[PDB]
Symmetry: C4
Subunit: 351 residues, 4 copies
């Protein structure tokens, strides 16, 4: 019997071919939709629907109270980070609720201290708890999701993550999750791929997680690796219902941290939660900076405008129709020309 062409005698050792966002484009289709008439609303969880299908990352350089307020007013939601005392995180929930009863979420870990944290957040009025781990395919994480749903599941929605396979998503569904968050490897500040050699390209990870979650009616949150507004449209067409953004929002006025004026240009700090600085395990994230981008309201406007353009080209009046769109796969030669190919740019572009 002949060998597998890439080596050895086991045809399942190399189990899949993984696609990322840069590997695909959306095909145009017959359409009566124009960008202005598209409806961008979508489910965050079984019970919660958002007007704009975007949430901010649970990171100490992205989401505290000011970002959560601005995201909710823009039609999305923020998830407050958990790298601070319980009493301070619960107080940031109250500040958001004092600005109009806006929707808000908050991250928790696994174990006894994370349980005390979760109960204080519920008492403060939080709408969504996010069980927030590097590897959710573990019985202790599944137990945490199920115990929260049993005790406070009537009052608050419970998200679990992160996963990158069909089998991991199915395990969270069986544990009672109200949404499943997908992403191991893809984030802009992630070094899991080179430190551990572990990960999954994000278009294939979404397609596999959706194969388990869609038949059960559980929404999927696509978390990490989104670099352009067009990546949001690709993630939702692969079957996700919302997208979570770190890098794209870390440059805004509302993100925690001060402005950095260096060489006449401006920046703000952005770091992984598994970086040396955030943990103060070998680190699985870096500490860096991103360009300053101005007010959050204007960033969200440009991102939703690109999504609306994609809905016009694909004939999708709603996000549920966009989830049925088709891809064309591209080669390396086709990606290099996608970033403005060979015409000296001179003027600023908003998107």
């Amino acid at each position: 019997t002949d060998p597998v062409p890439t080596g050895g005698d086991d045809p399942h050792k190399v189990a899949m071919l993984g696609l990322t966002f840069d590997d695909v484009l959306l095909l145009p289709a017959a359409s009566d939709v124009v960008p202005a008439t598209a409806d961008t609303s979508s489910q965050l969880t079984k019970k919660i629907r958002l007007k704009v299908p975007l949430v901010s990352s649970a990171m100490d350089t992205v989401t505290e109270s000011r970002m959560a307020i601005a995201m909710a007013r823009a039609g999305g939601m923020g998830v407050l980070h958990r790298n601070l005392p319980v009493a301070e995180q619960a107080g940031q929930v109250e500040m958001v609720k004092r600005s109009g009863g806006l929707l808000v979420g908050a991250a928790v870990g696994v174990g006894g201290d994370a349980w005390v944290r979760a109960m204080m957040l519920v008492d403060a009025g939080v709408d969504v708890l996010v069980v927030d781990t590097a590897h959710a395919h573990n019985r202790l994480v599944l137990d945490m999701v199920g115990k929260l749903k049993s005790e406070v599941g009537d009052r608050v929605e419970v998200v679990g993550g992160n996963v990158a396979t069909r089998s991991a998503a199915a395990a969270l569904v069986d544990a009672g999750a109200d949404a499943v968050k997908v992403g191991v490897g893809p984030g802009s500040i992630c070094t899991t791929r080179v430190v551990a050699g572990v990960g999954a390209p994000q278009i294939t990870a979404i397609l596999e997680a959706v194969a388990a979650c869609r038949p059960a009616g559980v929404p999927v949150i696509a978390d990490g690796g989104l670099q352009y507004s067009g990546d949001i449209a690709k993630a939702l067409a692969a079957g996700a219902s919302t997208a979570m953004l770190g890098s794209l929002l870390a440059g805004t006025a509302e993100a925690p941290g001060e402005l950095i004026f260096v060489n006449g240009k401006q920046y703000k700090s952005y770091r992984g939660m598994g970086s040396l600085g955030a943990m103060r395990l070998v680190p699985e994230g870096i500490e860096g900076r991103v360009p300053f981008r101005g007010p959050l309201s204007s960033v969200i406007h440009q991102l939703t405008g690109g999504l609306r353009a994609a809905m016009g080209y694909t004939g999708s009046p709603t996000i549920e129709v966009l989830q049925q769109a088709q891809f064309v796969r591209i080669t390396p030669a086709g990606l290099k020309e996608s970033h403005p190919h060979d015409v000296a740019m001179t003027v600023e572009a908003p998107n």
Copy 2:
């Protein structure tokens, strides 16, 4: 049942593998043709044949009256842009007609104002109307094509675009189009691919559109992404009958705009019609610059000379025979060496 190797259980979710110009080369074949004896004439529309199979883009940094006159004298044609008052566009048609009854086209949009524009252009003597949209697979665009053909189709030829699929090209054929223009995603100044995440690699887009148009006798115009004279030969071998050029002609003396002397080198402005500056929707084009290239007559001479070389290598005495030539697909390692690989260039090359 096993999953699709790239994810999920649907084998049509990733529907195609899209090739661009850099993915293919033309194979040499048995030939009695030398570059000097090749015949470069080809159909622009059902009724109009050109001596040179090239047209200039309908852009406000590429084609007004001076470019249209020079293109027609060179054996091709210009399409006048529509980012100006109706009375001015109609007057540029008259200026072209006063220089010898040369062929000329002009762009129009969709709706009531575009209808008034179209009727004034016909009264001024235009030969070709181009229904000029970002997404032609839409009933309002198909209605515009059909209504023009019904009212003035005896006097003027009617083009519709742009499309990137077999089904979209078939819909324009059924509506009465005299030619179909192909290109969503590929242009040098296009950002649709990253803003909306939408597009189609241009060799596959041409092959699919031709599968619908050739059996009906409708010519295909390949519009966008052409960077070298060899790309013209590849587009026509994939089945197109003419090519439309923006970047390659924006540097010429006849293009609208003034010369830009900067750092001892010279440039001219070139911008997408969906850029912020041209529209004064989120933008789907950039504003930039290209190197100055001299007179149009000399640029067209070099481009047609490269086409003639391809016809010699493939044994094609006419464009209709070139449309039957074969490709070899190349890998990433083969493209890097195609751009002069590893020999410090010292002297200027015209092409």
Copy 3:
């Protein structure tokens, strides 16, 4: 009959598709393992098990007595290089044995002088002899392995290498090798690939060698091309039992050579054993430098920490379970984003 699609009529002329480390990632799986509870021990040879599955390269810029002592104290082993007189190499074995009866290996060549060298190393107390060649698929190399095993095989373990195919690994197994070392082409300082045009991508080379060695109970040493801690996890998941490191350890305090302060940064010399300088045959290696990395103990700590993270993500309590993990294949677009993609790094990262 149709041609093979890549040329000619022989479907075995291009025999395989070879994958390297950058072509694959490890898939997360169901896990009760956390990085702290993983067991990193593994067989170096049939009779010798190490606490940490790493050995240092047999190179005159990587391993003399100080590196061998530090590697053994860290739980791994060093292999002393053979580019020095027999009496000096045997004396370095004694120095290692005087620091606590630590484990140590030493390289030898093929022929009569290499036999005298081998006997002196055994008299000095060496634990492992490494028959150390550029191409081990040769009857003289197989004879050397078998004769050593016959004469001193009761006292010392005998390794042979290097190979890159299933048939070559099988020949070393039949000759009596206690471990098989894999790697032709992949090393950071190797130029065999461009000087001779010969080599084998290392993930496929490991998969093929393991197909011969695992059924016989012979461990495989993955030698060359490892650039990050995650590459160690990939090599062991492909079926290797230990990894050998040159570049990653050449920057440490214990490596032979002096520090190089240049432009405020620090370096140390690193060169192939087939470079012009080491041989003083056309050269098949280069002479260069690598950044200074500090003490060996700290480098090994970071490398084993990344391995432990991979064991947590894959649910592997032991190295024998990690050898059963699965890969996802990635495209060129997915690799570019793996190296910290698009976030200006500002702070130092240990790994």
Copy 4:
């Protein structure tokens, strides 16, 4: 019926997948050969065998009398260029013959003037005539080969080229060629690929030409694209019997032209024979420069040493055995590491 996955309904429109040198490596195999014992002799034509399987390009910056003398003394051969008067080219043949009756070849074109040139070269004692064209798959070129063989074929050997397909090679075999030269697209100074969009990756072109020539006993000359000594071994393993070199020899003392000292480094001119300067048709080559490399004897020594290393790794005692060796295909990730990957080079390497 479903479409072809890359577009259209014709499965032969994209006829082949073309491999270049960077797409493959030679696999090591069982061997009793060491580099010193390999036999590098090989057929140039049916009747002429060389000691070293290399010839110099017929270019006015590579081969006049001094290069032809040095190549023959090194065991190879030179082909004198034809961009000069007939009387001068014939006189350079005599100069070579006055230095010891060394072997020499000379290029000619097609037509009446090329016939007069050919007869004068034969009278001057030339050993090989090379019918030297950009596209040999043409009845006028085949007639020239056949008429030369009929008139002077008893005294001189007749080569024809260049081709890049099985059918073109078969036509030259039927016309009586004593060897077939392969290469359309691959040369370092070639711009046919971007000017005409025409070419064929060189490993696939050799495999296809050999499928026609080997069964007839006609040797194949691999011409263009060779960048390293390892590329020579790959070309011969694909089935060629000799290789022709331009760039690799244009830097030597014996090449025509003067040394260029610029910025403390040294260069020499190198230009295509279809460049603007050589023709004084649109140009299909560039004019440039290459680094100075010293005496030819030393360059040939390093190139043959790399070939000898490949013969050791593959177990090939002769070139006829190397022509039976096997390849592994590599991905883009595997090529980037082949050029010395990540170790600051400090010292000069001869090869």
